[PDB]
Ligand binder design. Structure first.
Ligand SMILES: [Fe+2]
Ligand SMILES: [Fe+2]
Ligand SMILES: [Fe+2]
Ligand SMILES: [Fe+2]
Ligand SMILES: [Fe+2]
Ligand SMILES: [Fe+2]
Ligand SMILES: [Mg+2]
Ligand SMILES: [Mg+2]
Ligand SMILES: [Mg+2]
Ligand SMILES: [Mg+2]
Ligand SMILES: [Mg+2]
Ligand SMILES: [Mg+2]
Lengths: 299, 299, 299, 299, 299, 299
């Protein structure tokens, strides 16, 4: 049946666009595309016109997540499914769709208050191959796996699960992390394609909608050089290099100019439909800088 | 639809835990994990926290079989299917689920009286790779094929088949073995994944719930060394090395300290949905020690 | 340069041809070919007219080993190499070559007194496919690996090595086996193609030229059924099922009607040019019947 | 022609054997084998009886490197080659060969004074599979690539190159590293098989024969866990995680109890015969702890 | 060293060119190329300008075989080899080379009197793809295997073998065929590339230089349709469909308008350097029409 | 033996460096590297520090071709080979080698007067991945095939062939092109690795040393976009898109700012050692702009 198939794009808003352009290009290798618009620019990772929209005059947080469906029949079926289950949606007119550069667009909000968009028909600029903002050994892993994954704030995990399950995602609690206070932190991870997960969440308080965004390189050499760029430029590393037990990627977590975290990574594992859980990482991800919502002992 | 996907774990109870630890490690290569609990320890075969729970103060028999489903949606669908067909089940609370180290758990009994558990979300310790209790050339075959297979006692084969069929298993009578008394022994074999079978049974009387447990090595060299360990230690071999016509594995059957049989093996064939039957083994499995419920001529 | 490329054929002489025909067909699956000759018959394993010649009125021992070279240029080069190094050879005339069914033939004796023949151009009966003397799951491993391997008697290992090295073989001591008397038994193993070895020897006394002949099945099921045939017919098994550390095949050693041993096997490893040695088997090969020159503890 | 084919074994001497046993097992995953000898024990990495001999009462440095040749013909040819070129060698008697557990042994010293042994016929314990001293996800990369690589002290690079070239190695200067004093450090790297290099050296002063030993894991997860073990145990890391431009492995450099460095690594590239050079690493290998002969800026 | 690498071209002379054009196109699928020359036309099988030259006003027999060498260095080395061994050759001038459309050409005669040419640098018309003279399912097997194979007349097999061996061919007697008169017919087969053989011969009397030419289709369907064309047109079939024991191709032998035989075939086996012989075909090749030099019982 | 293995680098001199930087980046996608030197800059195509050196104040022509050998042993052997055959060479000192950024360098001139350099040990900047001067779908084909190929001026083809043959190249006349005046233009093509050819030449008069340089893209899309860039910018196209019969690449020929031609291409075929020749292209390469030394009808 009709389901979301990838995380297609995301919009963020920032207080310092100039800092973001330098950060995205030099530290990460993303491509900056400026179409001369007064209030925004774009970041590219592949042939798509863009994967991230960076709005100016902002709040240093997530503005929207854009989830792709295969085509108009799936768009319409999913819209009606959401309406029938009691969710509030709005089908956008052509001007709004053109703003996002998509053929069809609807807007809603997830149960945690995160603005959520569902669309079909992204604009692909095959004439304009990706050209990274610094030299790269490789490129990014996108394609059928979409742009990456995020953890976002939720207030009720069961409600969030219900919503994303309706959209076609699968998954549940995969981490039960012991905390010094004696409690346990539970995090749930959900997939909609071969990427281990595309969205994840728990019930931890959070000042921002977005906890982190993970972007995946094809080559280990690019991940390593990115890590070095963070160290040389003295950018906060919240979690050191390590490998989580679910996605099995080599990754670290570092500060963006907006204060939420980017997780550059390499060698993510294929999603599995069979639920299991873990109580720690395979190695690493030790805490270094704190204050980023990830002061947990993963070992 | 919703179905059992593997034999996930099993619990046994023993009169002599010390003998079992030495047996499991030296004779078989399993890993002993002791979490300091007064009444039990664990045996590992792979990344799962455990595959076998060994309870003390016991009856030298099977305590429960734990069957895995993919996730919560399948768990709930299967529970309702069992209720609708007239079977008695109990959904366990968090304390009971935590005892088994699973995210969701229900308890029932099969038609032969064997305690049967259905669960989702096993605990996987990716941080703690399998470390066998003796040096091994290889490891065990688990993964999508679960821990192994068992033959268990039944009083009514048709009723047992009905139950396991509802759980999603497939299979029927595969062996019709001539007996000297002129009768025929019929054994049925059922699969839920690529392992040739996970559960099997006939209508033969049996003092114990468990007839045998089969564990599969990846390497022939480990099977051979295990066989040698049984011979050198003068442990009863009930059936000598041979190959059954259905699962096509090289195996032998030897006594455990509890009196039921372990069947170490190598090179099991992929399960097939097309039913057929056989009247003898390919070779071997000659009777040596008797008194173990397998005094049959397989040739 | 010119070298021997395989063990092509062998001739044996027997006191009881009728017993040998039944043994070869029923116990091993070889094909008997009788061309109506008063004093001999043939055993086939593949498309070659034959691999073993069985002479009547015999001594229950090896008569000759026939080693193949690629063609006439290699035959002539090797002959001259042997002459130059001081060995005595005789190039056979057409009648003698026709007896062996080869295009070119020379006769000599190895340093241990074993009659040795070098030939080119075997007769292949492509019109007459192998038809085993009992039903087989598979066939034999021959082709570029020749018929099998043998251990034969030698009185001076260094001299034997010199001879076989000149013929193009490679290898050296691979087993140093501790003996109860405190000594060590050293055995050397030499290859001329991908079969782990084709000829092997040590300095142990021996009543016969031939210690054993190894024949390799393509299928484990045929090895197992052969083993069962020996057990059911109460034929002496000198060494039980096991795996040697060099050739890595699953094999056992059983009595032939002539008193020397046959070693049926399966899954032999590829020969390696890098010399190493071992002090025991991987598993098995325990002594059962004694008196066959292999009363050694291989573990 | 005759050439060295791998780094087969090495001998070291230590002041604190107990510390070394704990280090090798817990920090690296090597297997300790103690044969009850008063003055030494062994470390295993694979089926070889051992790869490293650890002598007691020592100097906390390298004692010998053992280089393998394929067999006796290569051993003898290489010996004569060394003699003809003016080097001093000694062919060892059986007692000395048995000490090293090899079939043939010769002793010499390289131009830098490093004791060098050439041997054929290592002892392989196929009956005794590797069993790591801590749980491992994988195993080590050995086989045709030998045990690993080392950098050792030399006083004259041209002379060292001449010697190793005669032994069959290939390679030359691959790194020209700028130094603050305005000079350049040149390091040469030589291979004898598919491992990027087995021996390397420059003309830098050094208090010890051995600068570092590199051991390669099959799995990234084991490298990462080893790195974590060094951090958690507060063991000096001389060079942080990084990738050199020649061997292309992910590696770090850490202190051993003897004061020279171990370089655990993963994913080494295949050796190439075409010489090239580099002036920096791909990423990482930043200096952390100093005093280990590697205070160079690799970037 | 320098060797012939393929049968590149052949020249024939015919009494009836019109009949030959119809035969080659309709019966075989060859392509006729007429360059407007008064005395000859060409037959193509692939991208080469031609593979067969058909001269008018002829003798209904072979005129020359053209054997290719890789380049000028091999041409010159082979010429000198022939001169040194006592053979008479002539290096052709540019006009003669241009006649054959080659870069270098020499002319000689084999020991049986067959005009033999050795050349390098054939003309390839990549602009002019093969276009068969009738519709074909597939194409011909040429490439590294050259145009096909022939049997030609010889008066002294040993002398012929000496000559072709000098040119770089390998092979010897492969068939010993019993004849009713009690004799044996011996035929020798020699290869210079992966085609089972390119030239073959025995000592049988023959009115023509050429006994047969074999051409190989890529598709069985084309062989079958060709066979049908011979039957429907009532063209003599000398040997019915069958498979020879050496080349293992499905083939039949049919009359050409010139009276010698064409052997269309499919699925020829790869040449082997190891000599063996056979005394019959695998099946078929029964005699039908006689008078073509192949009245032998192959079974 | 010792041979050249690739076209490693080339040096050109130009009158207009600014025009060349824009041309190389925008029209071709090469990377400009400027090290701040007053008289030159570099063009990159891969990890090598550079492949082309662009000298200022120049003659708008080739300055030198740099041919790579595997290492110092090959360098020294080739030098002595050249000296023994009567050619004049000079082994360069360290300053001259450092200028070219190589470990060893010698200078000579080919028989046509083209400055020729032979070197070992290029500088590879693995830390600095290729970053094209415009967005590219793919990258360039270099690696074991070197930078590309060139046609250069010669006055005596036989002499040129002798020289390049000594260096280890293979090949001969591959094109015989009919000319309206009734003559034939012969061009010879020589390879030293898998690239169809690396150097080619005939005896046509030429105002410049360099006729053309061919650079090969991995992706057809980049070739096509480059072609479009030439059309849109109204740059002379001397030969339109087409495919030559030898190298089988899709290519066109366009003017550089220096007046000699660049041949961007895609899908070149593997070099073959077997000489053949052609009299036309497969398609295309029609003449458009004239005056570039390629006014020939290739069809
Ligand atoms: Fe993440
Ligand atoms: Fe079983
Ligand atoms: Fe054997
Ligand atoms: Fe290293
Ligand atoms: Fe033929
Ligand atoms: Fe070109
Ligand atoms: Mg998941
Ligand atoms: Mg079944
Ligand atoms: Mg061997
Ligand atoms: Mg190297
Ligand atoms: Mg042949
Ligand atoms: Mg060429």
């Amino acid at each position: 049946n009709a389901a979301v198939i990838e995380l297609g794009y995301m919009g963020i808003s920032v207080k310092d666009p100039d800092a973001w352009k330098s950060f995205a290009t030099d530290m990460l290798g993303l491509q900056v595309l400026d179409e001369g618009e007064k209030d925004r620019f774009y970041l590219r990772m592949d042939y798509w016109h863009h994967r991230i929209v960076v709005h100016h005059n902002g709040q240093d947080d997530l503005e929207y997540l854009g989830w792709r469906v295969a085509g108009k029949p799936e768009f319409e079926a999913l819209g009606q499914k959401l309406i029938d289950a009691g969710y509030k949606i709005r089908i956008c007119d052509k001007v709004e769709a053109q703003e996002r550069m998509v053929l069809g667009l609807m807007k809603t909000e997830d149960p945690g208050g995160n603005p959520t968009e569902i669309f079909w028909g992204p604009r692909i600029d095959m004439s304009n191959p990706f050209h990274p903002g610094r030299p790269l050994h490789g490129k990014f892993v996108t394609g059928d796996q979409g742009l990456g994954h995020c953890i976002v704030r939720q207030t009720d995990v069961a409600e969030a699960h219900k919503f994303y399950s309706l959209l076609g995602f699968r998954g549940d609690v995969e981490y039960r992390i012991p905390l010094p206070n004696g409690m346990t932190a539970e995090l749930s991870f959900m997939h909609c394609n071969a990427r281990d997960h595309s969205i994840a969440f728990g019930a931890m308080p959070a000042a921002k909608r977005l906890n982190h965004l993970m972007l995946e390189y094809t080559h280990m050499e690019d991940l390593g050089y990115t890590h070095q760029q963070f160290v040389k430029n003295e950018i906060d590393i919240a979690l050191q290099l390590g490998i989580h037990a679910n996605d099995k990627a080599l990754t670290f977590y570092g500060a963006t100019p907006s204060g939420w975290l980017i997780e550059p990574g390499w060698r993510g594992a294929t999603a599995i439909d069979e639920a299991e859980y873990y109580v720690g990482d395979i190695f690493g991800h030790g805490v270094e800088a704190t204050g980023y919502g990830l002061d947990v002992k993963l070992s």
